[PDB]
Structure formats: C-alpha cells, structure tokens
Amino acid sequence: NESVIESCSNAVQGAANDELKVHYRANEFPDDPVTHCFVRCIGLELNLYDDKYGVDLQANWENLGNSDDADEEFVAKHRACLEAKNLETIEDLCERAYSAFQCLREDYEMYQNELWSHP
C-alpha cells in the first residue's frame, strides 16, 4: 500500500528516489541493492516475510487476493522454490529477501495482470 511504500522508502538508504519509486508503485522491482533492501522492508512491514522464518506462504496467498487456506500445490511449489535458493547461506539480508521473493514473482504478476517456508 501507499503507506508502506513511503515508509520503506525512508527506512532504506537510497530508496527515497523518484525513479525507483515510479517502479515500486508500478510493482516493478529491479535487481539492484537499494531495491533489494526496499523489497525486504515491504515484506517485513506487511508481515509477508521474516529474516529467520522466511516467506509466510499463507500471508502471501492472502495478499494474492484470496481469503481461504492456501492451495496445497501453492504451498508445496513455493516451499520447494525457496529451499532450492539456499536462503540461509545468503549473507546479505536484503539480497536474501529479494531472492526469496523471486519465487513468488510469477504469482504476483498473474494477480497484477501462518505457513512459514522456513519453520
């Protein structure tokens, strides 16, 4: 939402940038260090993500326009995607969050057009 975008743009060094914010409001998240930290911030703020427990799959399911229990195949597919990314070995917390969210890229794009993965 608007609120979390403005707050994270202030929280993250470099993110209060006109050009990046145009992308962010268009749901476009480039692979750059500032945007890495921005994506982490939004995930933390919306309770979609956690540095330790990873991606909250039920929370994201709901953020994809659903009010019910996540489909089993949605959970399975993303748990597997996230495990394959070996997130625990990614030392940079922003890079780790960005890499995590890449698993859910296709879902968010389709939509636009607790079930922690690491319990």
Residues contributing to the site for ligand NH4 (CB under 6 A): 12, 37, 40-41, 71-72, 82-83, 85-88, 94
Q: State the nearest-atom distance from the C-beta of 38 to ligand NH4, in Å.
A: 7
Cβ closest to ligand NH4, residue 95 vs residue 108: 95
For 47-84, give one letter per residue: b (16+ CB within 10 A) or e.
Answer: ebbbeeebbbbbbbbebeeeeeebeeebbeebbebbee
Task: Report, in Å, the least distance between residue 18 CB and ligand NH4.
Answer: 20
Torsion region of 67: left, alpha or beta (phi above 0 gives left; psi -120 to 50 gives alpha): alpha
Torsion of CA 111, 81, 114, 40, to 10 degrees: -70
Cβ closest to ligand NH4, residue 73 vs residue 113: 73
The residue among 113 and 119 lying less far from ligand NH4, judged by its C-beta, is: 119
Least spacing, CB of residue 19 vs ligand NH4, in Å: 19
Question: Nearest distance from residue 57's CB to ligand NH4, in Å?
Answer: 12
Tell me the Ramachandran region of residue 27: left when phi exceeds 0, alpha when psi lies from -120 to 50, beta otherwise: left
User: Based on CB atoms, which residue is closest to ligand NH4, 31 or 71?
Assistant: 71
